């Protein structure tokens, strides 16, 4: 689910665990107190699910958790009481994923009520799964 | 009697008729359809001496065919007869006679839909256009039989176009038939095969006729444009119909349309057609034609010539529609542009031939995004481009990490920073200044605010890409490294930098809202590196607040500067907690303005409403700062309470809203005084309680309450509510618990007796506002996390005696939902200690006694009672099930309320039975009793469902589906037993749903249900 | 004394009868009574240029109770299409009612009205409306319960039918 990686090797685009939450790093800064003193990296990131801004300042050679972000495609077959019942290409149905909010969920309930074929790209990081992107042919 | 019919028909359309319009209308509905109504209509149309309005009513009287198989044939003959009659009088010289022409088209379209349905007989029409063609060739009644179903070729169809009105009638006929098929498809979906009939015959004739209008010059008529859009709408709603060559010839026609040749009239109509396709169903156009659209829009070039024609002639509305069409076209290629830009997974490799094409592609898009001619007032390209760049930002954020280009972050930073440099002067307040100067207080101001809100969300999506140093630090260092006002009192004196700093303050605010300034040390590092940042922020507030409003433009801009400044100060409350010494200059600057808008009484004359808006925005920021900086604002507590004692006086120049938020601000500071123990903090709480309750009792017993005293008492009651909410411990010990449980200062006793003194007056108890705020204060301590030492936490007997006290003397219509909602809070709080006998006591006193008189005939009180029972089922079903009125009152009453005529009442009753059936919190004994009771009233229940489902119409079918799904899933065996009895009462075809619905089980009903409603509706 | 003919159309349950009753008697009807046929009522507005009498024809949105259904549109001088923002079906049928009006009349001023804006859960966003791009078409968010934008539709119709955009109802 998560793997350790040195804070100095953290990318400005990759993902990292901050305050037990997966977050996509939006900017990476490094600072030093003294020339003989050790440095420290200051990371700022957007929460990959809630969208909140989380940041952490930690010294170098320190290990940070990096989550395994997966983007999967499921055809939307039902919307039951705010829960997206999707269909995998292998024939399995997942109704545990809730319907997203905002214009994303509004466009999902709109296109699903119209009857069009809807594919949903869902992002699973650590223990949370939520619909992200939509595709129609 | 026909002369009498024409008399009241002409009387119906007269400007000021005699006797009555409603009665002659009802009498007109009485003449039809009866055995002479059909014949009356034919005589109204065959007579040439009748007026056009009388003949239109004849076509309307013909339209009533819903009242067996032979009368349809006898009608369609006379439809086509009166058709050919008026359609021959048109093309020579009649004018303004095409109104009845269109109505007869609508009637024939309904005939085409009804006859071509599955069910001596009649064979399908298949093609009304051809039948209309040969009817213009004049042993007599025998012609219509063979002309109907089989007709001539296309060469003779072109021969019909010898005149112009002939082509107009054919174009209008195809349009009306399509538009009616669209209305019939949108109304109810029982078609499924008529589209195939249109696809096999009518589609060919319309495409050959439309393409003939596009290719041939003499046959070309501008009416085909309105006909193409109609066909495109019908195709976009149903489904392969090509339309590819139509788009090709429309592109050739649009490109040929210039100022000298056509005057850009056809180009405008074709752009409206393309704008409809791109905005609704862009996939209807193939990739090749979209490539031609790209080369025409983006290219001297033809698009540049048309844009210069609109700009030089000052045609801003048509230029706005042009921007909408181009943006909607580019929005469908968002994923392709984002991929070919920032990722390496595309068609071509090792070029890079597409990059220099796409680097110029984005460069031209940025030139169009900038686009001279200031926004809203003139152009909308930048306004609509906001949604395009927003989709590109979300697409870039959604790209995979391993698929990004090496220069992806650099190219994204460069492009999106140029967007910031473009849109910052775009949302500049100088644009709104010119809008209010030129157009005044028009809708362009509202569209400019929507433009600023759209760019605000654009920046919120761009921050995840540019980051803090490339987006946030650019704004902070831009206004933090230079002083906006060198002279004291912070007067900018300069308009350009004032607009620039207000734009930067608005964008910085919307970006910082998405942050958390407490957990972040970065905000302290960037602000400490800017000496004049906070000085310039207060400079914006003081410059706008102290700006004298001479005209209406300076007045509205004054409200805008204060709004942006006060909002940013409220957002910086987290940074003020990290940097307390910078908080002092803000509080003084706010209270100085708060006094500036208080001690002055010059009101000529609507300046007080702008004064009140400023006073509201100031006290809102003070409430926001006190909400986060409760601890840092402790030294100001002794000053604020003193200031409160002067504001709470009945004689003052402050508004009632600022009084409430001030008490909320003082309560925010008192809430953080839990250090020295409950005794020192209760000194402030008792002082505020005695001040609020003392002023209430002072106002009630001296100056007999008028409308002014009602607003003052309501203000102080809301102040007690704000004090109760502000004293709630934030979600972000036993000494306070034992103290407030005993409350030696009698805080709850003084507040409760104060609310009682207000609600004991007849002028207040029957007012909904005082009952609403009364139930809010009493229910403040309810549903709070246990263990929190809340001061105003009331037990069950106190809230019970409160509702029982004021419910009989109040107005039951408007004040009951507040008492019931207060009861729902008490039920959820004391769910552990509640007793079914106590639930019956609340149900009888508050609801049952007032039911048969005030509730049963009131929809609001009805949904109120249903929502109350649903809350009990959600919290503790054992209270409602073990009720004495469960089987005697609750079940029979809610059974009758199933086929209600109100939508919200339907959803309320449907949710009740759905929760009653699908409840998972039932005990094993409770589940057996529920299944027993549902089986007892199941027959009556399913009858009420189908009764409501039959008598209802669209948009309320789904609310029944969720109900029917649960009843079939939980009781599948008795479902058939209850359907075979309820269906024939509410014909034989209904049995079809039984097999098809129970087979599904759940999750795809409704689709089976409306195919039953569609059947059982026509009959 | 100048009068104009107003035709009020829309799907059933959009608050058409409640809207005209709120402007006539000032009362809000809570119960839903489906209008049978048409109901024509006068509404007087005293503006700076005198009195204006709008003959408002509240039509029936239901296919069953429609009555003449389009005979009410004859000699119509202005029209108001009303939909429900809480019901998407009511908004998708706006082009249907607009088409039946453009079939009878040609360029009469038509006002679009999304009712029940006071509802917290709104299923029709204000940004989705693109029908206000026409000179004779204008949209207004109205609420018959809270009187939000109460006299706005009648004011726009008065400005189009007269030609004085500075005229307002201040009576
Ligand atoms: N909350 C809320 N409810 C409203 C509002 N306006 C109307 N309603 C409700 O909507 C229901 C619709 O009533 P009608 O006016 O008869 O509906 P209609 O549009 O006239 O449709 P027909 O009667 O079939 O012609 C009424 O019972 C009102 O209670 C509103 O502004 N807010
Ligand atoms: Mg009505």
Residue numbers in the entry:
A (entry chain C): 17 to 153
B (entry chain A): 3 to 69, 78 to 129, 137 to 155, 162 to 262, 269 to 328, 343 to 775, 786 to 1039, 1044 to 1076
C (entry chain B): 8 to 178
Publication text:
The crystallized export complex included the Pdr6•RanGTP subcomplex and S. cerevisiae eIF5A lacking its 15 N-terminal disordered residues. The structures of the Pdr6 and Ran molecules within the ternary export complex are almost identical (RMSD, ∼0.25 Å and 0.15 Å, respectively) to that of the Pdr6•RanGTP heterodimer. In the yeast eIF5A export complex, Pdr6 grasps eIF5A by N- and C-terminal arches, in particular, by the inter-repeat loops of HEATs 8–11 and the last helix of HEAT 20. Pdr6 interacts with both domains of eIF5A, namely, with the N-terminal SH3-like domain and with the C-terminal oligonucleotide-binding (OB)–fold domain. However, unlike Xpo4, Pdr6 does not shield the hypusine-containing loop. Most of these interactions involve hydrophobic contacts and are centered on W506Pdr6 and K69eIF5A. Ran does not only interact with eIF5A directly but also promotes Pdr6-eIF5A contacts by bringing the N- and C-terminal arches of Pdr6 (which stay apart in the Pdr6•Ubc9 complex and probably also in Pdr6 apo structure) closer to each other.
Pdr6 is an all α-helical protein built of 19 canonical HEAT repeats followed by three helices (termed HEAT 20) at its very C-terminal region.
